[PDB]
Symmetry: C2
Subunit: 436 residues, 2 copies
């Protein structure tokens, strides 16, 4: 049984505080580290920030730490809950909170305990975490599916100077035969990308953003896409590597229109595009480049632009700001046929049970699921076991640079090695990895 | 006893392959991950790289992995060595290699096994790794000393565009009272530094180098030092935070002279400085800024410039490229009075025993020891327990950004919490933390 629950403050990949939870059982101490999330959030679970400008720039998690230590811990020990019954753990946490967006205790305090329990349940059951996570989600286990990693290589929009409004350019080595191969291939494209970048834009152009990709001063989408196609080519992996985009269009949505030069800041309003004109630009890009996935193509409440686009897209369309891992939000997206893949961010909903529940509903509607990292990550490898337990066949966990990213990619290499012949690489079937 | 030894290839913070070793005993599986090192090296232990340009850009470690699996493992199991006898483990590894620079098996293959053993010895002894490492080095344990972190915030030289020839600017919160405080303070200076940088040099200026600091296009040392003094000021930590430099002067040493504008590339040769003129520029800097440590002020074989400088420096002088963690090199440095602190890079010598031996000799000569990270780090936290076991009172493990860096800083926070009153923060006595 659980004899102790403790929380301490530690730091995320950006140097901002985050919550670390330690759970003690008769089998040892189990720990989890929460990724940074939102402290203000409609439709999303809110993490709790101290807000004291005189400490950590107002990003402490001292309260959140107190909620775990002074509130949950005492209650949790007394409840004497079976960690194996994940739903029981989560229903307990939720009831303790009593808010819909975990704003009383904080999503950060709750998640930390929710993930540590699953670690402790695995230990107790004597199986690898991915296997316990597969038990919980009632996923097929013969074979297990290793996912295609969607590696961030280049960033624009709010994460770069230059005129480029699209936010993230990813490469996906769908052509590989094992996870180890896709990771090698992906790292070689990445390294060629850096060489080219430093050569065409300067030494500075070689530094990395929060997730590990470059941020040269780029003017257009073609410009960026051309750079990546050169890097794929230069690495000799043409045909084996596809492109993924994250438009994060909520960022340049203004007055019912889309401003492709939003950094302008004298943006010719005559050039803003309507949903349909935007869909024509994506169609163009899609014809010239090997794009297989497009995330957040339209704004988070622009329902009709999604539906319209969806009808003729023909590639995977990922909902991220549109669904913010919110089931009420997912059901609507499903009903409106706005997309066919969900970006899953466990800390956006706050509990393991609700995160598994959100993927199950997506799967039932024929949607694929892309498990995802946060901007402010940690050394914790939880999402690697989660992607395999869920059998989604696709993960977005950054570039092949910075260990908060590589920790997860390194964990996928171990799992693959351990499964032997009981594992298959999703490949070209990343979309529907669950039905493989 | 040791029943198994396995190695697998995994990735470092830069996306380049590295060796991971797993050691099995009756107490479980113990793992270590080696930082990337040198494959070509005079005076240093050489790690082994596959060199096959068609895979990982010729940086595979497949051979190194084979050396562990096919060569050491079989021999190691049969030798039936006590992991508690660290010297016995290391003498065994070394004898198996039979070269002076571990060029037959590779420093990367050997270190991986050398560090995993110490993990397994701790387990067996039932103590925290730092405590086992203190037992091995015959270090004082009452109290334990937590170190002042020398955080990289800004880089120049070969790591940046601009004319600035000095390579690394560090902040050291010697004024803090606990490790947790120094880390908070340090992160707040860092974050202010980023805000200022992005404001004065542009959004791009905000991206990070391999270690987590910024790399704006800076022209002079005063320029950079002025920026940091503003960030300290803006964070409100004036007086509590000091500056550390890493000149990496081997990089602009040419024709017996120092070229401060080596990126020139029309460097006015009339402006190159002799050792003594260079010492006058450092003296200047030292008078205007709160500099408490200077690493590699003169070139790696410029013996007389070191001695001369040393005589009137009055602050800590760190040997890094001068000693390359080589004891023959350290003895000479000691005898010539070229410096009074050693940068310790375990993978530069290849074994735990030799790394402890190199620190012990430094200490005996009255030198301080700065435990250090590599450019290509991992999620492994070994150097955090090492810095505490050695009682050095100072560590250089990057900026408070990128988890290959924060993993170590996060590990120091846990150790501090666990020691309670049995721990002291080195503070202003970082230099001689060992004699505290
Ligand atoms: Zn997104
Ligand atoms: Zn150095």
């Amino acid at each position: 049984a659980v004899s102790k629950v403790y929380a301490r403050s530690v730091y995320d990949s950006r140097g901002n505080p985050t919550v670390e939870v330690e759970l003690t059982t008769e089998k040892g101490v189990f720990r989890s580290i929460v990724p940074s999330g939102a402290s203000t959030g409609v439709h999303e679970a809110l993490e709790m920030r101290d807000g004291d400008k005189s400490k950590w720039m107002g990003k402490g998690v001292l309260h959140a730490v107190k909620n775990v230590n002074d509130v949950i811990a005492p209650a949790f020990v007394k409840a004497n809950i079976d960690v194996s019954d994940q739903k029981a753990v989560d229903d307990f946490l939720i009831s303790l909170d009593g808010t819909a967006n975990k704003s009383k205790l904080g999503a950060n305090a709750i998640l930390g305990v929710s993930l540590a329990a699953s670690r402790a349940a695995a230990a107790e059951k004597n199986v690898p975490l991915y296997k316990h996570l597969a038990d919980l989600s009632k996923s097929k286990t013969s074979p297990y599916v290793l996912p295609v990693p969607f590696l961030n290589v280049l960033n624009g929009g709010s994460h770069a100077g230059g005129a480029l409004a699209l936010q993230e350019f990813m490469i996906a080595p769908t052509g590989a035969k094992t996870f180890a191969e896709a990771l090698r291939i992906g790292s070689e494209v990445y390294h060629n990308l850096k060489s080219l970048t430093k050569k065409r834009y300067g030494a500075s152009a070689g530094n990395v953003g929060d997730e590990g990709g470059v941020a040269p001063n780029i003017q257009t989408a073609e410009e960026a896409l051309d750079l990546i196609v050169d890097a794929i080519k230069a690495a000799g992996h043409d045909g084996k590597v596809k492109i993924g985009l994250d438009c994060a269009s909520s960022e340049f949505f203004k007055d019912g229109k889309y401003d492709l030069d939003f950094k302008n800041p004298n943006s010719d309003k005559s050039k803003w595009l309507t949903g349909p004109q935007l869909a024509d630009l994506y169609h163009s890009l899609m014809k010239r480049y090997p794009i297989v996935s497009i995330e957040d193509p339209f704004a988070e409440d622009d329902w009709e632009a999604w539906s319209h686009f969806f009808k003729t897209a023909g590639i995977q369309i990922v909902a991220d700001d549109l669904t913010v891992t919110n089931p009420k939000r997912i059901a609507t997206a499903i009903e409106k046929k706005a997309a066919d893949a969900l970006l899953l961010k466990v800390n956006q909903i706050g509990t393991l049970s609700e995160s598994i529940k959100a993927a199950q509903d997506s799967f039932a509607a024929g949607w694929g699921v892309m498990v995802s990292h946060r901007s402010g990550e940690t050394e914790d490898t939880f999402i690697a076991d989660l992607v395999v337990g869920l059998r989604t066949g696709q993960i977005k966990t950054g570039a092949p640079a910075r260990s908060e990213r590589l920790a997860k990619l390194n964990q996928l290499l171990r799992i693959e090695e351990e499964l032997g012949d009981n594992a298959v690489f999703a490949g070209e079937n990343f979309h529907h990895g669950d039905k493989l």
